[PDB]
Amino acid sequence: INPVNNRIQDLTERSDVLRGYLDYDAKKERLEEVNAELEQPDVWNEPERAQALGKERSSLEAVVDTLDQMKQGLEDVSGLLELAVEADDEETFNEAVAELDALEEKLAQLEFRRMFSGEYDSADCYLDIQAGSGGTEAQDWASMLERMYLRWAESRGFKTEIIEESEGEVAGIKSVTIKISGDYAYGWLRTETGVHRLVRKSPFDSGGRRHTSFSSAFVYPEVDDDIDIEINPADLRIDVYRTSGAGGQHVNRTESAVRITHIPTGIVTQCQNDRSQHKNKDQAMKQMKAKLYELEMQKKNAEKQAMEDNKSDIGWGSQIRSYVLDDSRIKDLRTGVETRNTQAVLDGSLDQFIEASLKAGL
Amino acid sequence: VTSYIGGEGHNLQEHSVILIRGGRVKDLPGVRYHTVRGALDCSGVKDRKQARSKYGVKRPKA
Amino acid sequence: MSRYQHTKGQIKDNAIEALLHDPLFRQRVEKNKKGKGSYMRKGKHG
RNA sequence: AAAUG
RNA sequence: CGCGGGGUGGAGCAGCCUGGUAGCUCGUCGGGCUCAUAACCCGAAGGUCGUCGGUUCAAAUCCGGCCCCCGCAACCA
RNA sequence: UACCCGCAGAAGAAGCACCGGCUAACUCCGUGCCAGCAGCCGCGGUAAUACGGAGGGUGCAAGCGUUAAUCGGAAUUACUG
RNA sequence: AGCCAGGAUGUUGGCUUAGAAGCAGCCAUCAUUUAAAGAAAGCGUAAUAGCUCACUGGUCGAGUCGGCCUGCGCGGAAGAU
Ligand SMILES: [Mg+2]
Ligand SMILES: [Mg+2]
Ligand SMILES: [Mg+2]
Ligand SMILES: [Mg+2]
Ligand SMILES: [Mg+2]
Ligand SMILES: [Mg+2]
Ligand SMILES: [Mg+2]
Ligand SMILES: [Mg+2]
Ligand SMILES: [Mg+2]
Ligand SMILES: [Mg+2]
């Protein structure tokens, strides 16, 4: 029953941690205010507001309710632990154990939802590691990072695959792309996007000076490549008319030239290469399709540009961890969690950082 | 022009009416001016007890 | 807080990578106190 | 014959 | 739409010439050289020949279909 | 009005800059190429008399600093030179 | 076919949901008081509520219902002296 006791001890701690991350009191307050708003009969006159408020309420309630359940269940288990120990009633002990297990499961579920609330969190990812401005040292650092990541991925049970590797001319790697397949792979790794700070005495420097080299990790999920949808003839205007210059009697009469127009967007494609109108239309159709594709691409790019611009805005805040090897201390800048086991971290003990980051929601 | 903002932390943002005083920053390329802390839209530096004149910090009354 | 004005212009693909290839995330090399680039003409307090 | 750090 | 030429590892080329056979240059990997990198030296690996069918005992090779590319021709009023 | 006499009681009345070198005045704590400083040189990457606070000190003082402005140093447009 | 009456109980069946009470669905589609009453066919609701319907009791007092086979017709049916 010592392991059971240990588990019990752990569970309270993690509950407390969860509460801290959540900011539980504030949540409770919010739930209360929302509840108060709800019972006021005037709030259901405005329908859009009211449904939103209801939506807000329920999740908050769940969060709160689960939390104290956890508080209570643990206490109950502790109470029954004594009975298990001294009185030596086995059935009761078993029941207590079962209860604890249930509680643990519930806790896990709550933590799970807190963690993997994003859309693409369940999916697999491409981890992209790029070496910095340093040179050989930077490349080495990047390589080290890559190694660490691989070790981490192997640890939890993910399938790693080196898609592209640009090798460093002296030592290490210039860049690497790693496909990481598995259950909730992106959700587990998405926090690691950012610049990593190595601080160590360079073995590649002849002077042997202490260098501060940087290398970026970039985790992005494998999005499903959507099929490029067939445009409807309802959305299309097809004009037919005579050609420019033309050249003959049959050309003056015949309307071979085709103008296809997209009604929702306002794009036009003209074609008058062929004698046959049908052929022209086909060619024009193709052109239109191509244009649509291009437009889609452009829109995608623009949105993407906005996103990074926003990311750029953070600037120095993209620096997520500091790996000091001289003083022997790793610090996550985002959370504030510190460890002196640098070598262990390098080997692949990232769970301590990653989990905390997930809990934070950054 | 471009002007340096001295002291730890500032309230400044876009469309903020400020007073600049001159004095070039050696490190920064093209910076020839200092903003005046404690004049116009610009606030004084928080929690300073020394060299307050330079940073627009009022006397801590006790 | 204040925005960092990066020297990359209009970022198109990835922001983090761009930042890494910027003066912001340049390498910081320590000046030796003893060894190679170690000679000081005048001391800190001399 | 012999480029670079 | 018609007539030709092509698709052979990472790449660029051969072979297809009368069916049985997989070659060259670069690249990749492991050594050696240098304090190290490059060059150089040694030793290796790596190809269901676009794809699907057909016929000979047997197909990269011959024939046909389909997909992709490159030429040409797509005309007289 | 200046000025003079009487009344009471220490009473109503001290700050500003600086302290690495130039340049008078040094230590501890906090921070860790960060935040910041800076006239020049440069300081800060975990024992910082250079950052920020404190104690101690130095210089000025109802002013003290900062900026701008001119001459000086600058014999660096040299008539003197 | 009209007309008058009832058109319930366990029950708001659970779940998953923001809510779900016959009617967002997913699913089971039972039994009860029995004249008969679907865990519900339509309208309705933030959802309930509410308004109809199915089936049934009463009145009324002779034919009625909707398929098949075929005959002939109707709409579908807009053009330039
Ligand atoms: Mg080729
Ligand atoms: Mg042969
Ligand atoms: Mg070599
Ligand atoms: Mg063969
Ligand atoms: Mg002195
Ligand atoms: Mg110190
Ligand atoms: Mg000084
Ligand atoms: Mg100081
Ligand atoms: Mg002169
Ligand atoms: Mg007819």
PDB file of N, CA, C and O (backbone and C1' of nucleotides) in Angstrom, chain G residues 35-63:
ATOM      1  P     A G  35     -62.500   1.438 -20.208  1.00  0.00           P
ATOM      2  O5'   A G  35     -62.301   0.789 -21.650  1.00  0.00           O
ATOM      3  C5'   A G  35     -63.419   0.528 -22.524  1.00  0.00           C
ATOM      4  C4'   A G  35     -63.374   1.424 -23.743  1.00  0.00           C
ATOM      5  C3'   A G  35     -61.989   1.737 -24.309  1.00  0.00           C
ATOM      6  O3'   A G  35     -61.702   0.772 -25.320  1.00  0.00           O
ATOM      7  C1'   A G  35     -63.421   3.680 -24.288  1.00  0.00           C
ATOM      8  P     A G  36     -60.220   0.169 -25.499  1.00  0.00           P
ATOM      9  O5'   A G  36     -59.361   1.437 -25.946  1.00  0.00           O
ATOM     10  C5'   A G  36     -59.170   1.750 -27.340  1.00  0.00           C
ATOM     11  C4'   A G  36     -58.805   3.204 -27.530  1.00  0.00           C
ATOM     12  C3'   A G  36     -57.383   3.603 -27.156  1.00  0.00           C
ATOM     13  O3'   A G  36     -56.412   3.223 -28.126  1.00  0.00           O
ATOM     14  C1'   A G  36     -58.908   5.236 -26.367  1.00  0.00           C
ATOM     15  P     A G  37     -54.914   2.857 -27.668  1.00  0.00           P
ATOM     16  O5'   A G  37     -54.300   4.273 -27.267  1.00  0.00           O
ATOM     17  C5'   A G  37     -54.015   5.259 -28.276  1.00  0.00           C
ATOM     18  C4'   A G  37     -53.760   6.620 -27.669  1.00  0.00           C
ATOM     19  C3'   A G  37     -52.509   6.783 -26.813  1.00  0.00           C
ATOM     20  O3'   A G  37     -51.334   6.846 -27.613  1.00  0.00           O
ATOM     21  C1'   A G  37     -54.334   7.971 -25.855  1.00  0.00           C
ATOM     22  P     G G  38     -50.277   5.636 -27.599  1.00  0.00           P
ATOM     23  O5'   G G  38     -49.870   5.505 -29.135  1.00  0.00           O
ATOM     24  C5'   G G  38     -48.952   4.490 -29.590  1.00  0.00           C
ATOM     25  C4'   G G  38     -47.737   5.123 -30.228  1.00  0.00           C
ATOM     26  C3'   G G  38     -46.674   5.606 -29.250  1.00  0.00           C
ATOM     27  O3'   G G  38     -45.710   4.572 -29.075  1.00  0.00           O
ATOM     28  C1'   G G  38     -47.244   7.359 -30.763  1.00  0.00           C
ATOM     29  P     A G  39     -45.350   4.026 -27.608  1.00  0.00           P
ATOM     30  O5'   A G  39     -44.437   5.184 -27.003  1.00  0.00           O
ATOM     31  C5'   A G  39     -43.232   5.623 -27.663  1.00  0.00           C
ATOM     32  C4'   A G  39     -42.901   7.036 -27.241  1.00  0.00           C
ATOM     33  C3'   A G  39     -41.552   7.583 -27.710  1.00  0.00           C
ATOM     34  O3'   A G  39     -41.662   8.961 -28.060  1.00  0.00           O
ATOM     35  C1'   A G  39     -41.632   7.572 -25.341  1.00  0.00           C
ATOM     36  P     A G  40     -40.686   9.611 -29.162  1.00  0.00           P
ATOM     37  O5'   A G  40     -41.686   9.994 -30.343  1.00  0.00           O
ATOM     38  C5'   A G  40     -42.216   8.991 -31.234  1.00  0.00           C
ATOM     39  C4'   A G  40     -43.606   9.365 -31.697  1.00  0.00           C
ATOM     40  C3'   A G  40     -43.747  10.689 -32.452  1.00  0.00           C
ATOM     41  O3'   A G  40     -44.557  10.522 -33.614  1.00  0.00           O
ATOM     42  C1'   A G  40     -45.251  10.638 -30.619  1.00  0.00           C
ATOM     43  P     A G  41     -43.916  10.008 -34.996  1.00  0.00           P
ATOM     44  O5'   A G  41     -44.325  11.156 -36.020  1.00  0.00           O
ATOM     45  C5'   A G  41     -44.304  10.942 -37.445  1.00  0.00           C
ATOM     46  C4'   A G  41     -45.344  11.806 -38.119  1.00  0.00           C
ATOM     47  C3'   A G  41     -45.120  13.314 -38.018  1.00  0.00           C
ATOM     48  O3'   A G  41     -44.223  13.810 -39.008  1.00  0.00           O
ATOM     49  C1'   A G  41     -47.344  12.813 -37.400  1.00  0.00           C
ATOM     50  P     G G  42     -43.218  15.016 -38.657  1.00  0.00           P
ATOM     51  O5'   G G  42     -44.181  16.285 -38.604  1.00  0.00           O
ATOM     52  C5'   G G  42     -44.668  16.888 -39.818  1.00  0.00           C
ATOM     53  C4'   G G  42     -45.813  17.839 -39.548  1.00  0.00           C
ATOM     54  C3'   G G  42     -45.463  19.193 -38.954  1.00  0.00           C
ATOM     55  O3'   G G  42     -44.862  20.104 -39.871  1.00  0.00           O
ATOM     56  C1'   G G  42     -47.428  18.356 -37.932  1.00  0.00           C
ATOM     57  P     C G  43     -43.755  21.154 -39.354  1.00  0.00           P
ATOM     58  O5'   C G  43     -44.603  22.170 -38.462  1.00  0.00           O
ATOM     59  C5'   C G  43     -45.482  23.134 -39.077  1.00  0.00           C
ATOM     60  C4'   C G  43     -46.342  23.842 -38.051  1.00  0.00           C
ATOM     61  C3'   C G  43     -45.655  24.840 -37.135  1.00  0.00           C
ATOM     62  O3'   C G  43     -45.306  26.086 -37.734  1.00  0.00           O
ATOM     63  C1'   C G  43     -47.238  23.586 -35.900  1.00  0.00           C
ATOM     64  P     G G  44     -43.964  26.853 -37.279  1.00  0.00           P
ATOM     65  O5'   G G  44     -44.096  26.943 -35.691  1.00  0.00           O
ATOM     66  C5'   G G  44     -44.951  27.921 -35.059  1.00  0.00           C
ATOM     67  C4'   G G  44     -45.027  27.705 -33.563  1.00  0.00           C
ATOM     68  C3'   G G  44     -43.748  27.944 -32.780  1.00  0.00           C
ATOM     69  O3'   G G  44     -43.469  29.330 -32.612  1.00  0.00           O
ATOM     70  C1'   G G  44     -44.800  25.974 -31.992  1.00  0.00           C
ATOM     71  P     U G  45     -41.952  29.858 -32.643  1.00  0.00           P
ATOM     72  O5'   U G  45     -41.389  29.413 -31.221  1.00  0.00           O
ATOM     73  C5'   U G  45     -41.973  29.926 -30.007  1.00  0.00           C
ATOM     74  C4'   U G  45     -41.365  29.271 -28.789  1.00  0.00           C
ATOM     75  C3'   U G  45     -39.857  29.390 -28.629  1.00  0.00           C
ATOM     76  O3'   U G  45     -39.483  30.671 -28.126  1.00  0.00           O
ATOM     77  C1'   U G  45     -40.598  27.209 -28.016  1.00  0.00           C
ATOM     78  P     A G  46     -38.124  31.372 -28.621  1.00  0.00           P
ATOM     79  O5'   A G  46     -37.029  30.234 -28.403  1.00  0.00           O
ATOM     80  C5'   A G  46     -35.650  30.428 -28.774  1.00  0.00           C
ATOM     81  C4'   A G  46     -34.742  29.825 -27.729  1.00  0.00           C
ATOM     82  C3'   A G  46     -35.186  28.475 -27.165  1.00  0.00           C
ATOM     83  O3'   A G  46     -34.529  27.446 -27.900  1.00  0.00           O
ATOM     84  C1'   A G  46     -34.384  29.961 -25.439  1.00  0.00           C
ATOM     85  P     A G  47     -35.371  26.406 -28.783  1.00  0.00           P
ATOM     86  O5'   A G  47     -35.993  25.430 -27.686  1.00  0.00           O
ATOM     87  C5'   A G  47     -35.235  24.321 -27.160  1.00  0.00           C
ATOM     88  C4'   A G  47     -35.559  24.083 -25.703  1.00  0.00           C
ATOM     89  C3'   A G  47     -36.948  23.531 -25.399  1.00  0.00           C
ATOM     90  O3'   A G  47     -36.945  22.108 -25.533  1.00  0.00           O
ATOM     91  C1'   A G  47     -36.300  25.206 -23.804  1.00  0.00           C
ATOM     92  P     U G  48     -38.318  21.291 -25.753  1.00  0.00           P
ATOM     93  O5'   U G  48     -38.996  21.317 -24.309  1.00  0.00           O
ATOM     94  C5'   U G  48     -40.229  22.024 -24.060  1.00  0.00           C
ATOM     95  C4'   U G  48     -40.371  22.316 -22.586  1.00  0.00           C
ATOM     96  C3'   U G  48     -41.799  22.447 -22.079  1.00  0.00           C
ATOM     97  O3'   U G  48     -42.471  21.208 -21.857  1.00  0.00           O
ATOM     98  C1'   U G  48     -40.531  24.268 -21.272  1.00  0.00           C
ATOM     99  P     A G  49     -43.845  20.882 -22.633  1.00  0.00           P
ATOM    100  O5'   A G  49     -44.760  22.150 -22.322  1.00  0.00           O
ATOM    101  C5'   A G  49     -45.293  22.387 -21.002  1.00  0.00           C
ATOM    102  C4'   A G  49     -45.649  23.845 -20.818  1.00  0.00           C
ATOM    103  C3'   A G  49     -46.955  24.298 -21.459  1.00  0.00           C
ATOM    104  O3'   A G  49     -48.111  23.943 -20.705  1.00  0.00           O
ATOM    105  C1'   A G  49     -45.262  25.874 -21.942  1.00  0.00           C
ATOM    106  P     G G  50     -49.293  23.099 -21.394  1.00  0.00           P
ATOM    107  O5'   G G  50     -49.679  23.978 -22.667  1.00  0.00           O
ATOM    108  C5'   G G  50     -50.379  25.232 -22.524  1.00  0.00           C
ATOM    109  C4'   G G  50     -50.359  26.019 -23.815  1.00  0.00           C
ATOM    110  C3'   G G  50     -51.131  25.424 -24.982  1.00  0.00           C
ATOM    111  O3'   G G  50     -52.536  25.634 -24.875  1.00  0.00           O
ATOM    112  C1'   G G  50     -49.032  26.210 -25.742  1.00  0.00           C
ATOM    113  P     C G  51     -53.566  24.505 -25.379  1.00  0.00           P
ATOM    114  O5'   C G  51     -53.449  24.593 -26.966  1.00  0.00           O
ATOM    115  C5'   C G  51     -53.887  25.770 -27.676  1.00  0.00           C
ATOM    116  C4'   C G  51     -53.525  25.685 -29.142  1.00  0.00           C
ATOM    117  C3'   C G  51     -54.146  24.541 -29.924  1.00  0.00           C
ATOM    118  O3'   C G  51     -55.492  24.809 -30.310  1.00  0.00           O
ATOM    119  C1'   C G  51     -51.859  24.786 -30.520  1.00  0.00           C
ATOM    120  P     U G  52     -56.547  23.604 -30.456  1.00  0.00           P
ATOM    121  O5'   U G  52     -55.628  22.349 -30.804  1.00  0.00           O
ATOM    122  C5'   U G  52     -56.121  21.236 -31.572  1.00  0.00           C
ATOM    123  C4'   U G  52     -55.425  21.169 -32.912  1.00  0.00           C
ATOM    124  C3'   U G  52     -55.458  19.809 -33.592  1.00  0.00           C
ATOM    125  O3'   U G  52     -56.668  19.548 -34.299  1.00  0.00           O
ATOM    126  C1'   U G  52     -53.235  20.601 -33.581  1.00  0.00           C
ATOM    127  P     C G  53     -57.419  18.135 -34.117  1.00  0.00           P
ATOM    128  O5'   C G  53     -56.348  17.080 -34.651  1.00  0.00           O
ATOM    129  C5'   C G  53     -56.038  16.978 -36.054  1.00  0.00           C
ATOM    130  C4'   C G  53     -54.948  15.959 -36.297  1.00  0.00           C
ATOM    131  C3'   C G  53     -55.294  14.511 -35.988  1.00  0.00           C
ATOM    132  O3'   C G  53     -56.042  13.911 -37.041  1.00  0.00           O
ATOM    133  C1'   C G  53     -53.124  15.017 -35.165  1.00  0.00           C
ATOM    134  P     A G  54     -57.122  12.760 -36.722  1.00  0.00           P
ATOM    135  O5'   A G  54     -56.217  11.504 -36.342  1.00  0.00           O
ATOM    136  C5'   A G  54     -55.347  10.887 -37.315  1.00  0.00           C
ATOM    137  C4'   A G  54     -54.437   9.869 -36.665  1.00  0.00           C
ATOM    138  C3'   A G  54     -55.110   8.713 -35.933  1.00  0.00           C
ATOM    139  O3'   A G  54     -55.521   7.710 -36.859  1.00  0.00           O
ATOM    140  C1'   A G  54     -53.251   9.524 -34.680  1.00  0.00           C
ATOM    141  P     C G  55     -57.079   7.510 -37.222  1.00  0.00           P
ATOM    142  O5'   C G  55     -57.610   6.571 -36.051  1.00  0.00           O
ATOM    143  C5'   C G  55     -57.046   5.265 -35.825  1.00  0.00           C
ATOM    144  C4'   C G  55     -56.953   4.981 -34.345  1.00  0.00           C
ATOM    145  C3'   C G  55     -58.269   4.984 -33.582  1.00  0.00           C
ATOM    146  O3'   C G  55     -58.959   3.748 -33.738  1.00  0.00           O
ATOM    147  C1'   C G  55     -56.602   6.157 -32.353  1.00  0.00           C
ATOM    148  P     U G  56     -60.540   3.736 -34.021  1.00  0.00           P
ATOM    149  O5'   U G  56     -61.158   4.223 -32.636  1.00  0.00           O
ATOM    150  C5'   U G  56     -61.035   3.424 -31.442  1.00  0.00           C
ATOM    151  C4'   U G  56     -61.501   4.196 -30.230  1.00  0.00           C
ATOM    152  C3'   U G  56     -62.932   4.709 -30.271  1.00  0.00           C
ATOM    153  O3'   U G  56     -63.870   3.680 -29.966  1.00  0.00           O
ATOM    154  C1'   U G  56     -61.486   6.383 -29.396  1.00  0.00           C
ATOM    155  P     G G  57     -65.393   3.794 -30.473  1.00  0.00           P
ATOM    156  O5'   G G  57     -66.065   4.739 -29.380  1.00  0.00           O
ATOM    157  C5'   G G  57     -66.247   4.289 -28.022  1.00  0.00           C
ATOM    158  C4'   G G  57     -66.795   5.395 -27.150  1.00  0.00           C
ATOM    159  C3'   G G  57     -68.070   6.070 -27.627  1.00  0.00           C
ATOM    160  O3'   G G  57     -69.240   5.294 -27.381  1.00  0.00           O
ATOM    161  C1'   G G  57     -66.532   7.720 -26.915  1.00  0.00           C
ATOM    162  P     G G  58     -70.402   5.221 -28.488  1.00  0.00           P
ATOM    163  O5'   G G  58     -71.031   6.684 -28.444  1.00  0.00           O
ATOM    164  C5'   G G  58     -71.812   7.121 -27.314  1.00  0.00           C
ATOM    165  C4'   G G  58     -72.106   8.600 -27.398  1.00  0.00           C
ATOM    166  C3'   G G  58     -72.988   9.049 -28.551  1.00  0.00           C
ATOM    167  O3'   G G  58     -74.368   8.795 -28.307  1.00  0.00           O
ATOM    168  C1'   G G  58     -71.151  10.530 -28.331  1.00  0.00           C
ATOM    169  P     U G  59     -75.297   8.206 -29.478  1.00  0.00           P
ATOM    170  O5'   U G  59     -75.621   9.489 -30.364  1.00  0.00           O
ATOM    171  C5'   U G  59     -76.298  10.635 -29.803  1.00  0.00           C
ATOM    172  C4'   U G  59     -76.124  11.843 -30.694  1.00  0.00           C
ATOM    173  C3'   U G  59     -76.763  11.742 -32.070  1.00  0.00           C
ATOM    174  O3'   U G  59     -78.122  12.166 -32.008  1.00  0.00           O
ATOM    175  C1'   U G  59     -74.563  12.675 -32.223  1.00  0.00           C
ATOM    176  P     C G  60     -79.255  11.397 -32.846  1.00  0.00           P
ATOM    177  O5'   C G  60     -78.794  11.599 -34.359  1.00  0.00           O
ATOM    178  C5'   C G  60     -78.903  12.875 -35.026  1.00  0.00           C
ATOM    179  C4'   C G  60     -78.085  12.876 -36.296  1.00  0.00           C
ATOM    180  C3'   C G  60     -78.533  11.884 -37.358  1.00  0.00           C
ATOM    181  O3'   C G  60     -79.512  12.513 -38.181  1.00  0.00           O
ATOM    182  C1'   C G  60     -76.141  11.874 -37.121  1.00  0.00           C
ATOM    183  P     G G  61     -80.948  11.833 -38.422  1.00  0.00           P
ATOM    184  O5'   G G  61     -80.638  10.697 -39.494  1.00  0.00           O
ATOM    185  C5'   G G  61     -80.128  11.010 -40.806  1.00  0.00           C
ATOM    186  C4'   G G  61     -79.450   9.799 -41.409  1.00  0.00           C
ATOM    187  C3'   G G  61     -80.373   8.692 -41.917  1.00  0.00           C
ATOM    188  O3'   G G  61     -79.947   8.227 -43.194  1.00  0.00           O
ATOM    189  C1'   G G  61     -78.844   7.803 -40.344  1.00  0.00           C
ATOM    190  P     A G  62     -80.890   8.423 -44.475  1.00  0.00           P
ATOM    191  O5'   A G  62     -79.859   8.353 -45.687  1.00  0.00           O
ATOM    192  C5'   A G  62     -79.972   7.345 -46.708  1.00  0.00           C
ATOM    193  C4'   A G  62     -78.599   6.914 -47.170  1.00  0.00           C
ATOM    194  C3'   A G  62     -78.562   5.645 -48.025  1.00  0.00           C
ATOM    195  O3'   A G  62     -77.823   5.856 -49.225  1.00  0.00           O
ATOM    196  C1'   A G  62     -77.043   5.459 -46.207  1.00  0.00           C
ATOM    197  P     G G  63     -78.427   5.403 -50.645  1.00  0.00           P
ATOM    198  O5'   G G  63     -77.190   4.695 -51.361  1.00  0.00           O
ATOM    199  C5'   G G  63     -75.975   5.409 -51.686  1.00  0.00           C
ATOM    200  C4'   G G  63     -75.113   5.570 -50.455  1.00  0.00           C
ATOM    201  C3'   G G  63     -73.631   5.808 -50.690  1.00  0.00           C
ATOM    202  O3'   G G  63     -73.372   7.187 -50.943  1.00  0.00           O
ATOM    203  C1'   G G  63     -73.934   4.197 -48.971  1.00  0.00           C
TER     204        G G  63
END
